[model samples]
Target: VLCTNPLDIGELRSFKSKQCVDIVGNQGSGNIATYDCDGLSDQQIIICGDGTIRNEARNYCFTPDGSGNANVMSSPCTLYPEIPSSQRWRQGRRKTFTDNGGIEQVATEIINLASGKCLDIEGSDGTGDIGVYDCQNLDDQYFYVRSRGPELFYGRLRNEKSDLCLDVEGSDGKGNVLMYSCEDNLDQWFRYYENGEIVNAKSGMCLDVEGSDGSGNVGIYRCDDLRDQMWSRPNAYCNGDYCSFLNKESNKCLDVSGDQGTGDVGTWQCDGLPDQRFKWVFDDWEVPTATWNMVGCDQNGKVSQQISNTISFSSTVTAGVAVEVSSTIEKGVIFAKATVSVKVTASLSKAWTNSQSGTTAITYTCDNYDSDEEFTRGCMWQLAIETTEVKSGDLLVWNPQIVKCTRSNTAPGCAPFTKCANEDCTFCTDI
Candidate 1:
């Protein structure tokens, strides 16, 4: 007896039609029946009989639809076509046999209700028989629907940490559903469609493909931007480092680093450098380098030479006429002096100013004598020549004579007296 999706007898108590019934059968009777509950009408029930005599035994049973017999004890029953045959079971034997031939009666009692029917089979002999039965309208006999609705379904796989959903890459016949670990793997991904189109909850992007492997096994793809990574509904996505989105522009993952060594989770461009490439970890941005100029004086504070009077005078003087004064303080060194020369003409202008105050004109000649000799004398040297006799501005013209004189001790020798003022002239005597 094969019973598929059997219902418990206790569940039939809640039926609207409360009925108690029994099944009379010989030992070794094996029967199967189909239960017709509202949601679980697709389930089957089984009943078995064993021969040992027992006064009464409680059991659950099922009744066949359209059959006048309240208790249908038989085998090979079908509940619904949709249910598979592999999910079936049979009831255990209920009877035991005695040694004597004196017949012992084994009576089985059952409880029934509008919810469904229950079976109680009595055994006549020791051998056991089995059958299938169904309980209609019984809540406990109802099987839970694995598929909740058109859009909802139970997970075939479990043991995932992240609350992952299905992700399908473009409903383009190349999308396949898979169990996701809530990670970054492309295999465990699915999609949900609204109005025959896949919906991306984040960017509202449609499912697409990375490329056309073309057999519904889409390669790596993006959900939006028409990249190859997008897909359609009725699919699943994974967690735990699997379902990560990578940016082709930056060549980095859509992660916390955004391809930078340190930053919050965001979309960022990536370079091959370590500063640009990064894992999803905590980090800080580094400060940039600084530049500064050295602080100091130009040319190390060196000064130009001081312009002195000696340098000024030397720079302006003619070669022979110029007089140079030494700034040195050595003894016998003259600090100041002037050059002297004599010129003669008939017309007499004021005698050139000399160290002496008196002015006079005589036949001037070059005398090889120190002109500074007078100033060097210990006493104030007075000219030996007499000057009171000659009046001021008196024209004393002399005949032109080129004479070279030398200092001599001889007294008063001259060729001619150009002007005579006194009888005895000490300045020029016996000339």
Candidate 2:
């Protein structure tokens, strides 16, 4: 019995049969036949005729004693020991027969018990030929064989590393395992399944086959209930230097560490290299602020100041007033223009009123008359009144006065109209 292609069964016949007698006895009369028998139980039996003389038989007799006699019979041989006794002869029958005259031919005609069909071994008719037929669900066609165990088998997406298995490519219109191919082609994407469900390694996708057109490209696919895209296999080593993680939408590999830094992930062309490998780790967030400064000005037109007591400005004071102010200049120290106002009040009482009242208002001007030709020379000027009143309490009195002062480049000179002071006035009290 030659089992070709693991599933092809050539024939089943008796060793004593004229055609196969020589070959069958030499090759072991009963050998179980099968195809792709990676995992199965195998057992079989073959019977042979024992040559013995019968009653009233002559030499070279045409009808020997047991040939046609009713006492002619056959015996059974032990088939497979591993198979349970109840199932050993599950679907076959043992037969007995006789020949002409007094000779009895004990023939055990084993017929297929399930279908009640006669079993004929090919090439038993001296034709030196074998018969081929579709193996239906018949006793002679069924078989049992076991694979060399899981170690002998391997599973993987058609074009992935041996360690990786087939997974869904993407949310294809049909959900299925992604297919792949070493030849680099589209349409070769196929889905891989474990148990009854499709497998998903990355996203919810199955391994797909790359097209048969041979272009070593693969993709993931949504799980679709289709056998054409379904795949199966055992653990195998990645034959090539690298395996690819392809993108279903682009028909490309999930490239991560190639163009930029490590873990620089993205979908890219499937170039089998170490740089393309990747593994998911964690998740990532960021933070932000203003790029410009805030500014303002005080009522005196002075730039709003940032006064930190860390520094001293009193050394630049002019007159007894110090004249120093802090600034909020952010870009650096800068000169800013502003108008300084000074108020004056009356020192004397009943100066101009009806003997009991003081003046109400006045104005003063402090300017550098040389640079600004619009105003006359006067370092500090107060508005004075020339009023005459006949009263024993008569006195000059200055009331609340408003003064306008400008930054000066010229040194403060004598108080204007003060005859006793020099050009360089150290004090302005006399004025």
Candidate 3:
């Protein structure tokens, strides 16, 4: 799943839409930005073995945006000894599986997005109280708060845990909250006050506790503006991937008793349990943690790069009937610039005709191309690939015909052939 080039990643359009979560770009020069789909210099990125995301353009490191932005944007990408969130990036990929097919995949999914303490959703809908639930992919346990706001304090904790958007229990005040699949209500929205208190928009009551015996019971209480309801999302969790709501008042995380979705949400001692894990699904701007996954993120495709002299089909020669070796351009997948000429070592090899127009294979265009020998090298690499229509597969190279490399310099050809001396040997080495 670890790809050095984003262009080759394929399906360049989807990442802009919903399908993807977080994507950290190694935007060059000690700079880090939200992963933009456009293929720009700072946009191309590669994660190193050490976990730090390095910019592909200028090889700069993404450091904490110490400018009070609370965002990461550093260069001279260095990981400090204290292991501060500043250098939390590192790169590595591993193998995995996909549902589209039994296709194998790879990536750095194991890289925990720095958000800590899993945020849990109560009930099955948005109305359900949101608490610290153990981290699990169960539909209810999953919570998403947009990743961007006006600097800091901006959160509208929405829960659809029950059915996807639980309606509030009471409009007057705290009548004990629960689940009721609903949406678009101002009451459901929330705001993380600068003081750490999570207040409900509808009532003014905050996500608070009545019995603090460690029996985590979360509710919308009067915004006493005290530490009881104060909350803070640590920058250390998954380096901003996800976060757990830490109630400063009780020094406990918003928790769901058994770590189950059906259980009521409340505050509990921070145990670093899996149930305490939570993540931001989407936002005005996503964190830099991106997926190197291909099967789910990219369209199925394959590529190959190689160069050499004309292949020898000399072995195919038969009886007295002189054979005219010529081949039709490999069919399927076509690109006007991808024209790979037919080269066979047999008698008729050079005489082959190009049938590029007729094939019905997939077609591809290259944005990384322009009219220069250097540009062609990418990629045009002809003295470019006998270019072809775009299709997906394990590409095959033509078996060139071995011939006698003789002294034919002055007369012509700046060639790529090993001049042979004897007949017995088909292709002679420098030998």
Candidate 4:
């Protein structure tokens, strides 16, 4: 009865008899004892944070009669600080042991801080008397305090014997839960409900054992009030490391058949064979390179006034590129172009301007004027492609790989530009 996460208010069940803690004869003014598990008010318990354990309905606290008789009976509940240490009971420490069946188990001890005496059951056979005695590591002393809930234990579930993680095969929806390598994936993560059901985060299916004989593969199934689906409180650590699963009805560990590989998970007697452990990936991408790809050139005509014969030019260049997953250089060949700024003579005048952000297409316009100079004015533009590495469908981490390109335009007697005016255009762009 090792409940790692004890509820503040709930029923305390015995590890030995599988019985619920209760008041003798369900009497409000009676002594504390254990009886068949049920949802009666007599079996309801509440653990106050101020070191006091009280009954849910009776408003009575567990008080040890100081007559040195080891009797812990019910008395009117009193607030802490006012109630002495004998009346204050603490949900205390945990101890691990190998049972007679050679199976490992952990138990939590409820002890009185002053006397260090632990709560014990007189008979421990489904119905027993409750009292305090010198601390002993017995099954009757182990109790699990739990309550109904939507609040569940969320974490990885590892088998006690196999040491492998409990993984659901159908992470897409629902599938059989089996023993697999601890990959730290969502399929391996599960939430243990207070209803004794274990649900996987990915599929929201309960951990279901196939058979009632405490033997059969485990799988994810639609949850219902099934005894095969109920699980005991998993033994989890304080550091949020790993957890071990146990089937409540069967009183067996969630066991795996093999030591490694795709082992089938099953329920079996808590015989420590080789299992028990559970616990709680990264996408890498980058902007490798950027290349200049000329999307086709545009040539259009425009009318000009005869009073001021002139040449006009404008071009919009567009190109799209995606960075695939590969480890190689972008063998992007560099090309030369004309830096069309307008070379003007006494009789002829020309002007041009280009605009664009990094990785986008460049659009430029050029105009030439002369009384009768009808010389053709053509311009070609190219896109400076900046490749960015991306994970499957989204951008997780990114580094901009900006590529620089010299301005280009078609103008009379203008030389093609060889290199960018500013090489520091990656982060410090003039434009």
- Candidate structures ordered by TM-score, highest first: 4, 3, 2, 1
Against the reference, the lDDT scores of all candidates come to: 0.21, 0.23, 0.33, 0.47
Per-residue lDDT over 214-331 for candidate 4, one digit per residue giving the tens place of the 0 to 100 score? 4577887765445777776555421244444677677777766654424777776664444544443112334222223322222453222111111111212221111121111111
lDDT (C-alpha) at residue 139 in model 4: 69
Q: Compare candidates 1 and 4 on TM-score and give the better one.
A: 4
- The lowest-lDDT stretch of 10 consecutive residues in candidate 2 is 322-331
Give the local distance difference test score of model 4: 0.47
Backbone clashes for every candidate come to 85, 82, 72, 11
What is the full ranking by lDDT, best candidate first?
4, 3, 2, 1
Query: How do the residues 1-431 of candidate 2 rate in per-residue lDDT, one tens digit apiece?
Result: 11000111111223233122112122222222221211101111111111111111111100111211111111122223321221112223332232111112223333222233333333233232222222233333221111101111112223222222233333332333332222222222222222222233223343444543212333444433233223322222123433344433344554443443232233455565544442211111000000111122122332222211111122322211110010001001111122111100011100111112212222212221212223333233222221212232222222112111222323333211111123223333222
Error of 2 at 139 (Å): 13
Q: For candidate 1, write residues 1-431 as lDDT tens digits.
A: 11111111111211111111213332312343222221111121122111111111112323333322233342233324421222222222222222111112122223222312333222322122212124332222222111101111111112222233333333331343322224332222222222122323222233333343212222222332232232212212224322333333233333233222233223333223332221121111111111111111112221112111111121222211110010000001110121111101000000110101222222221211111111111111111110111223222111111121213223212211111112121232111
lDDT of predicted model 3: 0.33
Model 3 worst lDDT run, 10 consecutive residues: 288-297
lDDT of 4 at 134: 77
TM-score of 2: 0.18
TM-scores for the candidates: 0.14, 0.18, 0.28, 0.34
